[PDB]
Design a binder for this molecule. Structure first.
Ligand SMILES: [Mg+2]
Lengths: 99, 99, 497, 94
């Protein structure tokens, strides 16, 4: 097992996010290649659920429901967080030899 | 042998998915303009149901491209053959050795 | 995942609602919109099997008129029977199908329907509209009788104006088909008589029209002791539903024979505003129900009513005809629709801006007094009683109203003009349209609003019927306002289901 | 394992049709069936005497019924689960 992290990076590189973060947040202090995105809390099942949930563009019955991180009542570019971590918890192997 | 055969929609499944998307969006499925003609109705609750479907035999006005059910993965895949033959001769002595 | 519930009951903030593709009370298919209704009563199943025209926003350029059927025992619950009459070919005469009629002949036990096929880009020598017939053995599958092609120019009528074949059977056993066509530049309802629905003889001109106007979907029937002809005006300025009264068929024919203009009542035969078109009636033997289509609005905006004419197609609306002792006809809420609402919702006041006073369940409002109630739901029934100081007051009910609502859509019952006006109040202050009715002499009004999703029908003391398409109405507060007189509202009840 | 069993073979060709006592020329590129009448024939009642499309192919038009061909008529030929559209037109010869 291992843990990977980036400590120092140029500001422009961190901003464009070619090494992680998708250009939204700096990858500094996180695993290399980590991606920042939205959170899908199921899908809408009724107009009542759609109305109860915070407003967002394209909201409709049967569409993906996105969690409001900041609880501002609107889904926008600020409702993103670290969700992808391309580092396994642990990798193992087993070999058995019988004669 | 190819084991990770991705399950893709056949002709009937593709037509059914097209009809479902059209009725979900509220447009007329018969307006797909892809040679598909759908016989469909409504249930007691008003949810659309698809009784049947038909297809134009030729996808083009020139009658040069007949419609058919094709398994693209099976068509492009096969059963691969692996052959290996190794022959090694070694001869070692305290005064000299070779392999 | 945990769902978050917002306290709808307690906040008067304006909310952006959304409508569903399918409607429960006022039937509308999830795909497309309903056009001109085709009411019909099945003598076998003892129910109502109303057909209609399917319309889509991206209509095909050549043949755009699918026909679907709706089956219902009453005016509340509806079911879809699927497509009945397939759209014609590009070059066929039935590419576009107009409004028609339907009868069930018991001699051969067959359902015969008559429709109007419209040729796509017709030539000069080709008739633009031709009446055709389809036959069904069980109202499930239909076959178009290709041997029948009735031409308007055969009997000297207009080639390009031959619409709405309404078929009905008299007591003598012969069938009559009425066509609202044009003859020598004059509007004429022409009658064709038959005994087997296969050979038709033109029995001259059944009626003439009124200042060379055009009517849509004529329907002649008898209600007890009077004969009524109900029709929809094709004129853009009017674009509403009118009717005539007559003691006998001969009396009705002699009525407005040559510009006589014998209106049935003081309201010129008005029944509903521009939000109700192609109203056609059908009877089950004890009750008379009329079906029409309330049009939609461009950009789902209530303010944009539509220049010249409103948008075609919309939502199916069913009302109950009411016959008085003087022969006047008024639209009433169906009993099934009225009884569908079961649960009751408590009402309360959220806004106090004017100088009204509150005394229990009774509220007194003066000039500039407006009181805002709680939010509505998808289905609502608001019933109350209003007593006015005099017979010249201007009270009103406003929907899409809230504390921060920039604009609201109001219906003002003006007693001085003796009518009601649907207008866009707030930051626009734009008057949309109106509808006339009879002001009661006791200054008493029984206001009942039945709202399904976006369509709303308001009944005033069983005399005024007013249909409106108000988007964003559901889950929004509604208000009562007064402008010139004094009003007293009581018995405010809200029912939902 | 992958086929949907929708019998896509569906021979929907049209060999020849005859209205009353007149044969029709069939063009497959534009899906047209042209029938000419000797500039005096009544073109409002024509009985579909014979037509042969293919094996297992069904058409909306029946045999023995009379049709009006004053305008082009759309004919749908269905075999199995596939369909094909033709336009039958009749011309009064000039
Ligand atoms: Mg947010």
């Amino acid at each position: 097992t291992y843990r990977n992290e980036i400590l120092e990076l140029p500001e422009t590189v961190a901003a464009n996010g070619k090494f992680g973060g998708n250009g939204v947040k700096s990858v500094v202090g996180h695993t290399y290649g980590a991606q920042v995105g939205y959170i899908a809390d199921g899908i809408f099942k009724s107009q009542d659920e759609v109305d109860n949930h915070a407003t967002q563009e394209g909201a409709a019955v049967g569409r993906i429901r996105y969690r409001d991180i900041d609880h501002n009542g609107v889904i926008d570019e600020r409702d993103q967080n670290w969700i992808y971590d391309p580092t396994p918890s642990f990798s193992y192997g087993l070999n058995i030899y019988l004669e | 042998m190819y084991q990770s055969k991705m399950n893709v929609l056949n002709t009937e499944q593709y037509g059914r998915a097209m009809w479902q998307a059209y009725v979900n969006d509220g447009e007329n499925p018969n307006g797909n303009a892809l040679g598909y003609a759908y016989n469909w109705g409504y249930n007691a609750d008003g949810n659309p149901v698809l009784y049947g479907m038909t297809l134009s035999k030729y996808l083009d006005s020139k009658n040069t491209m007949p419609v058919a059910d094709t398994d693209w993965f099976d068509e492009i895949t096969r059963t691969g053959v692996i052959q290996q033959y190794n022959l090694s001769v070694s001869n070692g002595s305290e005064k000299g050795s070779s392999f | 995942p945990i769902l978050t519930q917002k306290n709808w009951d307690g906040t008067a903030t304006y909310f952006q609602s959304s409508d569903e593709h399918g409607f429960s009370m006022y039937y509308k298919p999830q795909v497309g919109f309903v056009g001109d209704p085709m009411p019909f009563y099945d003598p076998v199943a003892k129910d109502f099997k109303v057909m209609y025209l399917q319309d889509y926003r991206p209509n095909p350029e050549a043949t755009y008129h699918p026909i679907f059927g709706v089956a219902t025992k009453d005016g509340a619950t509806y079911e879809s029977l699927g497509e009945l009459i397939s759209c014609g070919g590009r070059d066929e005469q039935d590419a576009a199908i107009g409004t028609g009629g339907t009868i069930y002949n018991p001699a051969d036990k067959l359902y015969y329907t008559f429709y109007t096929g419209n040729k796509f880009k017709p030539s000069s020598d080709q008739n633009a509209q031709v009446v055709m017939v389809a036959t069904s053995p069980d109202f499930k599958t239909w076959t178009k009788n290709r041997t029948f092609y009735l031409k308007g120019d055969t009997y000297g009528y207009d080639k390009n104006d031959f619409r709405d074949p309404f078929l009905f059977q008299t007591e003598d056993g012969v069938y009559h088909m009425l066509i609202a066509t044009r003859k020598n530049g004059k509007g004429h309802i022409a009658e064709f008589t038959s005994a087997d629905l296969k050979e038709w003889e033109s029995a001259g001109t059944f009626m003439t029209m009124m200042w060379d106007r055009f009517y849509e979907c004529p329907d002649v029937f008898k209600m007890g002791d009077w004969w009524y002809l109900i029709y929809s005006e094709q004129a853009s300025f009017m674009r509403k539903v009118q009717y005539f009264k007559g003691r006998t068929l001969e009396d009705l024919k002699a009525t407005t024979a040559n510009d006589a203009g014998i209106w049935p009542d003081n309201r010129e035969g008005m029944l509903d505003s521009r939000a109700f078109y192609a109203g056609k009636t059908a009877s089950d033997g004890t009750n008379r129900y009329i079906w029409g289509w309330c049009p939609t609005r461009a950009g789902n905006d209530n303010g944009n009513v539509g220049d010249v004419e409103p948008e075609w197609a919309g939502n199916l609306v069913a009302q109950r005809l009411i016959q008085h002792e003087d022969g006047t006809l008024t639209l009433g809420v169906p009993d099934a629709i009225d009884r569908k609402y079961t649960s009751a919702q408590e009402v309360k006041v959220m806004a106090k801006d004017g100088n009204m006073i509150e005394s229990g369940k009774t509220y007194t409002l003066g000039e500039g007094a407006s009181v805002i109630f709680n939010r509505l739901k998808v289905h609502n029934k608001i019933s109350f009683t209003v007593k006015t100081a005099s017979n010249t007051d201007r009270f009103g009910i406003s929907f899409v109203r809230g504390t921060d609502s920039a604009s609201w859509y109001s219906i003002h019952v003006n007693a001085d003009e003796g009518k009601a006006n649907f207008e866009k109040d707030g930051d626009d202050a734009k008057y949309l349209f109106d509808n006339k009715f009879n002001i009661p002499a006791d200054n008493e009004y029984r206001v009942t609003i039945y709202s399904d999703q976006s369509v709303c029908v308001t009944y005033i003391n069983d005399q005024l019927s007013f249909t409106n398409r108000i988007y964003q109405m559901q889950k929004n507060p509604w208000s009562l306002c007064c402008y010139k007189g004094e009003i007293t509202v009581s018995d405010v009840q809200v029912s939902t289901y | 394992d992958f086929k949907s069993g929708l019998r896509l073979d569906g021979d929907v060709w049209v060999n020849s049709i005859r209205l009353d006592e007149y044969a029709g020329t069939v063009d497959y590129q534009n899906k047209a069936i042209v029938v000419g009448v000797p500039y005096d024939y009544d073109i409002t009642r024509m009985v579909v005497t014979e037509m042969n499309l293919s094996e297992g192919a069904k058409a909306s038009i029946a045999i023995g019924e009379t049709i009006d061909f004053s305008l082009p008529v759309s004919l749908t030929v269905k075999n199995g689960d596939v369909q094909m559209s033709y336009t039958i037109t009749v011309k009064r010869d000039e």
